[PDB]
Design a protein around this ligand. Structure first.
Ligand SMILES: CCCC1=N[C@@H]2[C@@H](O)[C@H](O)[C@@H](CO)O[C@@H]2S1
Length: 586
């Protein structure tokens, strides 16, 4: 499944061979990043003698002159054609040609191509990821991997802003990066450039900013240093601060200054973005004028970020109208999923859903704030990419499955199993929840009512529950040993162990339900207590962060079911055999 889905696609049911011998036209005129990709896909030979013709270029290039009517007149648009006679890979601009090739790479299966005509472009101008979470910032290796992933999925934005990076936030936003870190950011910028991603470097100065000439110059001098490392897009974040830094008038003046004396002065600055102190509807003062000050005061080329009606929320038609009215421009959406920095004992690996698919025109950008777990975040990131490029065609579940199969082809069904029951956030201070384990939730619910009653269960149910636990262990063990994406396995390991132990506990609890004789029952019960203690051990020793320490898994439907069934069969036993068994699950 292409990924993101093109705006317009016509498939002829013919398929052609990737040319054994070919004629390249435009190789020296077209986007070198695109030509690179094309040349990688091709295993010789070049032939002036001909050779099937492959034409590559941007609108204006001599190579693509014949097809200029065909090229969509949109930023990052392109036209792609495959037929018996010719291949055409024509961008509206340089990024469009790179994107043509990202679609092209996906069509080529087993050295063959379908016969297709594609006219394509993004529905939202800026699409990508803000690394803007609290916690351990992404490793340098994880970032290099992200930027390549962003290029393949036509994401054009990476906003660097980890809350915990000292040279991004207070005090030390005033200081240039040390040489080591500097050389690393330089490398990130090179790699982002190669992949057609705007590396957007953010600063977060508002906690100790002085509204004086000294701090203002320090900010520009920092921006200048970042420029010298290759950075061409900038942001100033005023989120989650208090004190003098929250002053909207001073914020707008600062940003206008940066625009005027820096963004409008360098030859090639792309994005200039700001993050308001009031960044969702629920935390905005209706009677005072924070957001209208920004909307009126800020130069119209400056972006303003927004999370929707609450800190964590999905974007609605009503929600975007509300903010767009006040800021006098389309909001640049910061979506807080799958961001887990306030539910740090959970992994959030379910589908991306909830955002209205008809409001592309009402947003200038759409970025996802992810987990501190970089590779794990690729399931959502891939999905957000698909959503922000073609929201009209956005399919929740298929994109999720596509993401998983792209990330881990070798164990995709195993990863789906694991992700399916690692979706929900649990109870949290923001009240944001996701669905989890819905496949088995009716079976779970029937089975459990038919017990907390005494009314006999369904055999169908019993073996779906048992089928589930079995599948959970298979997936957990296969994942642990998977070497195709080791960094992903490393992130999820603790939850993989916990997920296995949940499945095992599940299986023993059901063996207790079929309790054949008194002492097989007690073997089961004792095994359950031992498995509980192992889960408690992991929860006490893994992921011991100061905020939500530990490791929770399958918490919405599966853990509750097992816990409740266990306390139930035990209580029936404490009355058939008049016992004193501990029925507790903590
Ligand atoms: C335009 C929104 C700016 C925001 N800043 C923080 C962010 O750093 C956290 O990652 C997120 C979830 O805890 O909560 C808020 S949202």
């Amino acid at each position: 499944s292409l990924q993101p889905p093109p705006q317009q696609l016509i498939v002829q049911n013919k398929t052609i061979d990737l040319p054994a011998v070919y004629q390249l036209n435009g190789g020296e005129e077209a986007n070198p990043h695109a030509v690179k990709v094309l040349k990688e896909l091709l295993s010789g030979k070049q032939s002036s003698k001909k050779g099937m013709l492959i034409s590559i270029g941007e609108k204006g290039d001599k190579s693509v002159r014949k097809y200029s009517r065909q090229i969509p007149d949109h930023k990052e648009g392109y036209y792609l054609s495959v037929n018996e006679k010719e291949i055409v890979l024509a961008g509206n601009d340089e990024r469009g040609t790179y994107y043509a090739l990202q679609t092209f790479a996906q069509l080529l299966k087993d050295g063959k191509l379908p016969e297709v005509e594609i006219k394509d472009y993004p529905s939202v101008r800026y699409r990508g990821v803000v690394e803007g979470f609290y916690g351990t910032p992404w490793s340098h290796q994880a970032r290099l991997s992200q930027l390549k992933f962003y290029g393949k999925n036509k994401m054009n934005t990476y906003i660097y802003g980890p809350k915990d990076d000292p040279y991004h936030s207070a005090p030390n936003w005033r200081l240039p990066y040390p040489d080591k870190e500097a050389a690393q950011l330089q490398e990130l910028v090179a790699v982002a450039n190669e992949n057609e991603v705007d590396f957007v470097w953010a600063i977060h100065p508002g906690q100790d900013i002085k509204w004086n000439k000294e701090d203002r110059d320090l900010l520009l001098a920092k921006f200048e240093k970042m420029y010298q490392l290759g950075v061409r897009s900038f942001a100033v974040f005023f989120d989650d601060i208090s004190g003098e830094g929250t002053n909207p008038q001073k914020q707008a003046e600062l940003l206008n200054y940066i625009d005027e004396k820096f963004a409008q002065v360098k030859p090639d600055i792309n994005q200039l973005v700001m993050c308001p102190t009031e960044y969702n509807k629920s935390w905005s003062n209706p009677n005072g004028n924070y957001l209208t000050t920004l909307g009126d005061k800020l130069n119209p080329s400056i972006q303003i970020m927004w999370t929707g009606d609450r800190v964590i929320s999905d974007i609605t038609r009503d929600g975007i109208s509300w903010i767009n009215e006040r800021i006098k421009r389309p909001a640049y959406i910061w979506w807080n999923f799958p961001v887990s920095d306030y539910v740090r004992d959970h992994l959030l690996l379910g589908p991306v859903y909830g955002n209205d698919t008809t409001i592309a025109k009402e947003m200038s950008g759409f970025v996802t704030n992810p987990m501190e777990h970089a590779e794990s975040s690729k399931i959502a990131i891939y999905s957000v990419a698909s959503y922000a490029w073609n929201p009209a065609k956005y399919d929740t579940w298929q994109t999720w499955k596509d993401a998983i199969r792209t990330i881990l082809p070798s164990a995709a069904e195993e990863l789906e199993c694991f992700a399916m029951h690692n979706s929900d956030l649990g109870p949290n201070g923001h009240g944001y929840r996701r669905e989890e384990s819905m496949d088995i939730q009716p079976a779970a619910e029937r089975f459990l009512k038919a017990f907390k009653e005494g009314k006999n269960y369904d055999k169908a149910d019993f073996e779906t529950l048992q089928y589930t636990f079995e599948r959970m262990k298979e997936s957990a063990d296969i994942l642990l040993m998977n070497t195709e994406n080791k960094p992903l396995i490393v992130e999820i390991t603790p939850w993989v162990h916990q997920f296995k132990l949940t499945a095992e506990m599940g299986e023993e609890v059901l063996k207790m339900v079929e309790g054949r004789n008194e002492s097989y029952f007690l073997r089961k019960y004792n095994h359950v207590k031992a498995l509980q203690q192992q889960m408690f051990y992991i929860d006490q020793t893994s992921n011991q962060n100061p905020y939500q320490p530990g490791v929770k898994t399958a918490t919405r439907v599966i853990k509750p079911l097992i816990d409740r069934t266990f306390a139930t069969v035990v209580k029936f036993f404490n009355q058939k055999f008049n016992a004193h068994l501990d029925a507790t699950t903590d």
